[PDB]
Amino acid sequence: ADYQGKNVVIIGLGLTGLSCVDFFLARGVTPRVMDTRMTPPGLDKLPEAVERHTGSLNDEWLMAADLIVASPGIALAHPSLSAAADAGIEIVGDIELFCREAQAPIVAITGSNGKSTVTTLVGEMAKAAGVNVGVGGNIGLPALMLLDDECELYVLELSSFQLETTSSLQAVAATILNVTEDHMDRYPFGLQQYRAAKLRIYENAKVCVVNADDALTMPIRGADERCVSFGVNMGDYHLNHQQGETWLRVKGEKVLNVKEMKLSGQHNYTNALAALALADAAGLPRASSLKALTTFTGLPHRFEVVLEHNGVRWINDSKATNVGSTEAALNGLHVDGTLHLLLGGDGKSADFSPLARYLNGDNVRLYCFGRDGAQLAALRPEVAEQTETMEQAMRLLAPRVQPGDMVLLSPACASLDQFKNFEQRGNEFARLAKELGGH
Numbered sequence: 001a002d003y004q005g006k007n008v009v010i011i012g013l014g015l016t017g018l019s020c021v022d023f024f025l026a027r028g029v030t031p032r033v034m035d036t037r038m039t040p041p042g043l044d045k046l047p048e049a050v051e052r053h054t055g056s057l058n059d060e061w062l063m064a065a066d067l068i069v070a071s072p073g074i075a076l077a078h079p080s081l082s083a084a085a086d087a088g089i090e091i092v093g094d095i096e097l098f099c100r101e102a103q104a105p106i107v108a109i110t111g112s113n114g115k116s117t118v119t120t121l122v123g124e125m126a127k128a129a130g131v132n133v134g135v136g137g138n139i140g141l142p143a144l145m146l147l148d149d150e151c152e153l154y155v156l157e158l159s160s161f162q163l164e165t166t167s168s169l170q171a172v173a174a175t176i177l178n179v180t181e182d183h184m185d186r187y188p189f190g191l192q193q194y195r196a197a198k199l200r201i202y203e204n205a206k207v208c209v210v211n212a213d214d215a216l217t218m219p220i221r222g223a224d225e226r227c228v229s230f231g232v233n234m235g236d237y238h239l240n241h242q243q244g245e246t247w248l249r250v251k252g253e254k255v256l257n258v259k260e261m262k263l264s265g266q267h268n269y270t271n272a273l274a275a276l277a278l279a280d281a282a283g284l285p286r287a288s289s290l291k292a293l294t295t296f297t298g299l300p301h302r303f304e305v306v307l308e309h310n311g312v313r314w315i316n317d318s319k320a321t322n323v324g325s326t327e328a329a330l331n332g333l334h335v336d337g338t339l340h341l342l343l344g345g346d347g348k349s350a351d352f353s354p355l356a357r358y359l360n361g362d363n364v365r366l367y368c369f370g371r372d373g374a375q376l377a378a379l380r381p382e383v384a385e386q387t388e389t390m391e392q393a394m395r396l397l398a399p400r401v402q403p404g405d406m407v408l409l410s411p412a413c414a415s416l417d418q419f420k421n422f423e424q425r426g427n428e429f430a431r432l433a434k435e436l437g438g439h
């Protein structure tokens with residue numbers, strides 16, 4: 001598309017907004033930019049020529065624009081944007097700009113949880129085939145930074161927020177991995193409104209990879225001839241457990257024993273299935289995609305085995321900052337002895353009731369900490385202890401573990417009451433696991 005001579009206004013000075021600034025400058029267009037923060041981080045990366053307004057939105061700049069490029073962090077429902085829309089001003093996001101320029105096929109991945117794992121895994125499948133693949137879309141690698149005529153395949157992680165402002169995506173393969181009650185400040189009409197944003201990913205997709213276990217991932221008018229499913233018990237791509245072992249199964253055929261993989265957890269096995277389905281649909285060779293499943297290490301803090309010693313597996317799932325992530329960790333969980341489950345932090349008013357279903361059984365102990373520890377201990381008080389900190393909780397459980405046990409940090413909560421971020425929480429857990437369980 002051609003933006004020469006247009007009055008372009010960008011909202012957001014995070015890395016996404018900065019990537020939009022670069023996009024227009026590279027095309028000889030000098031945009032204006034605004035951010036509601038007084039001192040956004042990206043301010044000191046801007047060139048002198050770019051007019052900027054911080055500390056609020058600038059309504060007259062919006063109402064004068066030919067094109068508004070909105071960060072995913074502001075809602076189309078914000079009054080200033082609604083007023084611009086009412087005036088007929090075009091509002092797009094970075095992904096819309098990307099889709100108008102992309103000259104290679106796009107694999108598009110959304111869902112409440114699992115996006116970065118599946119996106120990274122599809123990217124590894126492409127790399128194993130020797131494809132110059134561009135993987136991005138998260139806040140650390142905005143999609144526009146990937147645009148290059150040398151790129152042969154794009155693999156994008158897309159949020160519901162980005163999909164709301166995107167109309168031109170034509171994915172070769174698209175998935176909604178799952179939909180769980182989250183992000184509800186932005187979706188005041190509930191789960192079906194959150195879903196509706198994600199459902200946009202299937203518009204004009206050639207193949208829709210759907211979750212056989214989550215009906216909210218089905219396209220809006222239902223399953224159609226484009227749909228390929230993945231699931232635990234059944235689907236085009238599913239899991240087979242027999243005689244103590246587990247295999248990935250595709251169209252009625254085992255393709256891989258999961259012992260060849262480096263990932264753990266049933267939900268990571270279904271992530272592997274979704275990735276394989278997407279890669280297959282994209283035209284990547286099956287053999288190299290399976291090879292990638294055997295070499296992919298997984299991402300830090302995503303149900304990550306940081307120590308396996310003396311028959312005890314210590315699992316850093318610090319990125320489980322919400323209930324849906326921890327529920328998926330507990331569902332189908334394989335533990336020979338006792339699960340020592342670490343829950344805690346700032347739960348952001350979540351309903352933890354869903355976790356109760358998994359917390360019966362004589363082989364579970366809860367160790368609850370942080371701001372909302374008392375609420376988490378209440379799930380099942382007779383097997384629960386409460387401490388202030390994660391380290392205190394780990395020192396409580398360490399003398400009790402036995403071969404066959406699992407120590408799982410899957411907090412279901414944000415870390416910011418006690419840590420700088422979830423990476424610091426997971427790194428501290430890994431340090432303590434080695435101190436306390438390594439000998």
Ligand SMILES: Nc1ncnc2c1ncn2[C@@H]1O[C@H](COP(=O)(O)OP(=O)(O)O)[C@@H](O)[C@H]1O
Binds near residue numbers: 114118303319326329
């Ligand atoms: N398919 C899934 N369903 C639910 N939770 C998942 C799934 N895949 C991974 N998770 C968990 O969600 C958290 C974030 O995983 P990640 O792959 O970073 O997702 P996202 O990029 O969507 O934030 C981790 O706790 C991880 O174990």
Ligand SMILES: [Ca+2]
Binds near residue numbers: 012037
């Ligand atoms: Ca802003």
Ligand SMILES: [Ca+2]
Binds near residue numbers: 386387388
């Ligand atoms: Ca206490």
Ligand SMILES: [Ca+2]
Binds near residue numbers: 321415416421422
């Ligand atoms: Ca956090």
Ligand SMILES: [Mg+2]
Binds near residue numbers: 116
């Ligand atoms: Mg992500």
Ligand SMILES: [Mg+2]
Binds near residue numbers: 213214
């Ligand atoms: Mg079901």
Ligand SMILES: [Mg+2]
Binds near residue numbers: 347348349
């Ligand atoms: Mg609170």
